[PDB]
Structure 1
Amino acid sequence: PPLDLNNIQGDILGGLPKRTETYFFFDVTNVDQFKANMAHFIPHIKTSAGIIKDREAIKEHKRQKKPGLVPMAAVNVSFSHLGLQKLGITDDLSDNAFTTGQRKDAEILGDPGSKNGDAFTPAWEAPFLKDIHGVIFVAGDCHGSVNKKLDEIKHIFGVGTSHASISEVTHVRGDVRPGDVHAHEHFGYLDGISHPAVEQFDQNPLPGQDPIRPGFILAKENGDSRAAARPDWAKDGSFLTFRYLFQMVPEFDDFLESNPIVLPGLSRKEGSELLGARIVGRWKSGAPIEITPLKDDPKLAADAQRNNKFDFGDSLVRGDQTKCPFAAHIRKTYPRNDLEGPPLKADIDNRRIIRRGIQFGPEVTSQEHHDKKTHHGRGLLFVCYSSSIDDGFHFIQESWANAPNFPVNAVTSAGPIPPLDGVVPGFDAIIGQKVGGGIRQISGTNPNDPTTNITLPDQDFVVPRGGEYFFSPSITALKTKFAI
């Protein structure tokens, strides 16, 4: 049955358009006042229908050569398990990660941290060690528009007054990068290229974009394997994973410079560039190394019709890492034919996620470049959606990125594959974490000598400093369960 796009929060299907975004993390201090205030908040929430209407209007204005308006910033809302509990909404949503919460789950994710008995505390900024009940987030074109809309929302809940119904835990801000690199993450790689197409939503999937059933993103829609276990109010909500991911840019650049791929005919500079590309799975431009393994192709990169049409063929069963290491980030996070082809012919639609990241922080300074060391915080406000954190984000992190034997272990489960004997892909070098913070390695980066590993520097390139798992309910869920 068609999706009710008026009922779905707009960041899930569509995505809030932005140059800047604020995430406001709160605790509920007076439940019944919160629910009364929620009634006034709900009409401000951007829906998926709204996303489409707004984007068509901006396009039409541009075609008509009308000057642009100040767009109102857009707002969405999401609640943690702790917040559901505080509100007396006690239905089990059938996601172990969400229910556990990210502060405890971060031990298994591999985050740095310490233990006192069985109690793990991740090495996070202080506010993310507190119980967080929800997030209100506001996206827009400039700081003024976001701040105006956020102040209006805060006013609804009486924030900072003696009649508040919530309190600020903390807030974080994202900002796209300057100029032509605005959609490049801070390591320099174009981000946001590959997402699953969603049946009943994406009417014209791109070449190479296999569409998946909407229930892999939205609870209780077609394809949600847990639909019968979940409460009716959960229909058309999605699980929002937030990760506050600091990046160590100069350190990564130093790594690459210190480990150029030695290949006949390449200079040190070109070998270092190729290494970066091979660790990610794309050149900085976005061109996929599977299509262009020897050198960048900026024209390919810029063409959405071509830049994602690859599946890794049968390179895994052949043991062939010449075009792309097995442990490249994109391959660790969306395996394509590594799992979907023979021997497994696996259905990994439940491993798909929709990402809505935005960068944070200033550009690398001259002193940082000279020093080859980070002096300022910068990174990614990682956000992804799916109908199961257990199947998606958590699984990806623990079972794929953190698993040095993946994807060899998965395919040799089915039968012996002699070209894979002894092959140990290693960690995803962007996000892979080793519990206890020990030695990580990555193999397959030199196309001529796949067996050689690089042992990564002990400072991980990405450092998590906070996070939580939330559920973004539908508009009718908010009206009926969250409001009076």
Structure 2
Amino acid sequence: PPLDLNNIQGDILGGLPKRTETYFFFDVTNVDQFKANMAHFIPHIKTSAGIIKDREAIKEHKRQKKPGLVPMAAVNVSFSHLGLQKLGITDDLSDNAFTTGQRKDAEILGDPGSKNGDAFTPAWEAPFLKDIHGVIFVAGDCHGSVNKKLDEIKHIFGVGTSHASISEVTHVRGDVRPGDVHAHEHFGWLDGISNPAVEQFDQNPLPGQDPIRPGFILAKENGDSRAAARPDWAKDGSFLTFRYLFQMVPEFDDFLESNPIVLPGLSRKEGSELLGARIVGRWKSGAPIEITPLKDDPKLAADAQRNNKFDFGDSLVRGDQTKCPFAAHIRKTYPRNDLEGPPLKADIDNRRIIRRGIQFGPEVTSQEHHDKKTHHGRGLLFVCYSSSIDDGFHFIQESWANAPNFPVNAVTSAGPIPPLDGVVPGFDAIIGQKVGGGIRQISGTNPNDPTTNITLPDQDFVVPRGGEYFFSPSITALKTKFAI
């Protein structure tokens, strides 16, 4: 069937274009007044149709050399399980992670925290330990637009006044980095390269971007295995995972400088760069190591038609880590042929996620660089979408990233593979977390010596400090279940 793009919130399919973005986390205080205000709010919501239409208007305005105008920052909205309960919307959405809420789920994600008996409290910023009912987020070209748009939303809900239907728990702000590295995350890598193409939305998949069915992103659409268990209003909504991930950049840079790979043809500097590339699965530029294993290639990196056309072939079955470690970040989170090829021939479309991350915080200072220690908060506002957090984000984090035997344990489940005997890939070095904060190791990072492990510093390079699981309903769901 064709998708109704006027019904689907625009951050999901399309993505809200942004140099800056504010996420406003709130609690409902008066349910009836909240539902009445939502009638006024809903017309402000950007849909996927809206996105495509804007993108064309920007292209014509830009082809035509006009003086370059304010993209009326787009608004989206998303609700936690605690907010659905609060609103009287009690139909089960058949996802344990969402319904559990991420404060609890975080124990199993591997977040640092502590236990009173069987009660777990993650080591998050104080506001993310309160009940959050939803998030209103607004994304645009500059601070002026976003704030102006957000002030208007706050008038609609009466924020701060005696007649208020929501209150602020906290807010967070993302900002693309300055200049040439605007799309690079704070460790230095080009981010936003690989996302799944969606059948009946993405007209021209890029090479290496196998399109998946829309029900793996949107509830009750084609390919949602849980379609029959879900209520009609859930159609064309998607689960939004938010993770407030702080990055320890000077500690990461220092880590690389201390562990250079000694390899014919490379400086000390270059061996430290090779290690970073191998840990991520790409050069900072964006060039995938599976294509260019030993030196960066900036032209390949800048070309969307060549920079994602690889699948690890049968390197895993053969035990061959020469081009790419098994435990590289991108391989841990999208295995490609490691699982889709023999022996498993597994269908991992339900493990795919659409990422809409934005960076935050200042650049690294001279003092921070000199100390080789972090002094300011910076990192990534991580946001991803799928029709199942249980199958997507949670699983990726627990069974792949945090699992030092993955992917060997997956492919050896079918029968031992002698070239993998004794291979323990190790942790995803970027996001892998060990429960209790124990010792993490990663193997295969030296092309010439695949069995040597690096023991990671106790201070993780990425440190979660907040997050929650939300559901982003359709325009029509909002209109009938959240309005009046």
Give the TM-score band, short-chain normalised: over 0.9
Question: Which string of whole-angstrom CA distances, capped at 9 and with x for unpartnered residues, describes residues 93-139 of structure 1?
Answer: 00000000000000000000000100000000000000000000000
CA shift for structure 1 position 262: 1.2
Name the CA distance, whole Å, in 2 between partners of 1:208 and 1:446: 26
SS of residue paired to 2:306? coil
Name the CA distance, whole Å, in 1 between partners of 2:435 and 2:154: 39
SS of residue paired to 1:137? strand
What percentage of residue pairs aligned between the two structures are identical? Answer: 100
Name the CA distance, whole Å, in 2 between partners of 1:20 and 1:62: 20
CA shift for structure 1 position 92: 0.3
Name the CA distance, whole Å, in 2 between partners of 1:357 and 1:40: 28
In the alignment, which residue of structure 1 is the partner of 2:448? Answer: 448
Q: Compute the TM-score of the two structures, normalised by the length of structure 2.
A: 1.00
In the alignment, which residue of structure 1 is the partner of 2:243? Answer: 243
In the alignment, which residue of structure 1 is the partner of 2:208? Answer: 208
Question: Which string of whole-angstrom CA distances, capped at 9 and with x for unpartnered residues, describes residues 40-86 of structure 1?
Answer: 00000000000000000000111122222112110000000000000
CA shift for structure 1 position 411: 0.1
Name the CA distance, whole Å, in 2 between partners of 1:178 and 1:412: 45
Name the CA distance, whole Å, in 1 between partners of 2:473 and 2:70: 28
CA shift for structure 1 position 219: 0.2
Question: Which string of whole-angstrom CA distances, capped at 9 and with x for unpartnered residues, describes residues 185-207 of structure 1?
Answer: 00000000000000000011001
Name the CA distance, whole Å, in 2 between partners of 1:207 and 1:380: 27
SS of residue paired to 2:99? helix
SS of residue paired to 1:291? coil
CA shift for structure 1 position 326: 0.2
SS of residue paired to 1:6? coil
In the alignment, which residue of structure 2 is the partner of 1:257? Answer: 257
Q: Structure 1: which 4+ aligned runs deviate by more than 3 Å?
A: none
SS of residue paired to 2:390? coil
Name the CA distance, whole Å, in 2 between partners of 1:365 and 1:69: 33
In the alignment, which residue of structure 2 is the partner of 1:367? Answer: 367
CA shift for structure 1 position 416: 1.4
SS of residue paired to 1:480? helix
CA shift for structure 1 position 263: 1.0
1:425-436 map, 5 Å: 425-436=425-436
Name the CA distance, whole Å, in 2 between partners of 1:465 and 1:208: 34
Name the CA distance, whole Å, in 2 between partners of 1:204 and 1:479: 32
Name the CA distance, whole Å, in 2 between partners of 1:470 and 1:108: 18
Name the CA distance, whole Å, in 1 between partners of 2:264 and 2:47: 54
Question: Which string of whole-angstrom CA distances, capped at 9 and with x for unpartnered residues, describes residues 414-445 of structure 1?
Answer: 11100000000000000000000000000000
Segment of structure 1 superposing worse, 259-268 or 272-281: 259-268
What is the aligned length? Answer: 484
Name the CA distance, whole Å, in 2 between partners of 1:301 and 1:6: 34
Name the CA distance, whole Å, in 1 between partners of 2:239 and 2:222: 16
SS of residue paired to 1:225? coil
CA shift for structure 1 position 208: 1.1
In the alignment, which residue of structure 1 is the partner of 2:400? Answer: 400
Name the CA distance, whole Å, in 2 between partners of 1:202 and 1:130: 38
1:241-390 map, 5 Å: 241-390=241-390
CA shift for structure 1 position 265: 2.4
Q: Which runs of 5+ in 2 are unaligned?
A: none
Q: Which runs of 5+ in 1 are unaligned?
A: none
SS of residue paired to 1:192? coil
Question: Which string of whole-angstrom CA distances, capped at 9 and with x for unpartnered residues, describes residues 187-245 of structure 1?
Answer: 00000000000000001100111000000000000000000000000000000000000
Question: Which string of whole-angstrom CA distances, capped at 9 and with x for unpartnered residues, describes residues 367-387 of structure 1?
Answer: 000000000000000000000
Name the CA distance, whole Å, in 2 between partners of 1:440 and 1:11: 35
CA shift for structure 1 position 267: 1.4
1:111-260 map, 5 Å: 111-260=111-260
Name the CA distance, whole Å, in 1 between partners of 2:199 and 2:406: 29
Name the CA distance, whole Å, in 2 between partners of 1:416 and 1:173: 48
CA shift for structure 1 position 480: 0.1
SS of residue paired to 1:174? strand
Question: Which string of whole-angstrom CA distances, capped at 9 and with x for unpartnered residues, describes residues 153-186 of structure 1?
Answer: 0110000000100000000000000000000000
Name the CA distance, whole Å, in 2 between partners of 1:68 and 1:461: 39
1:47 aligns with 2:72: no
CA shift for structure 1 position 396: 0.1
SS of residue paired to 2:317? helix
Q: Compute the TM-score of the two structures, normalised by the length of structure 1.
A: 1.00
Name the CA distance, whole Å, in 1 between partners of 2:62 and 2:365: 36
Name the CA distance, whole Å, in 2 between partners of 1:302 and 1:448: 29
Name the CA distance, whole Å, in 2 between partners of 1:257 and 1:123: 29
CA shift for structure 1 position 338: 0.2
Name the CA distance, whole Å, in 1 between partners of 2:447 and 2:330: 18
Task: Please tell me the root mean square deviation across aligned C-alpha atoms, in Å.
Answer: 0.4
Name the CA distance, whole Å, in 2 between partners of 1:69 and 1:186: 28
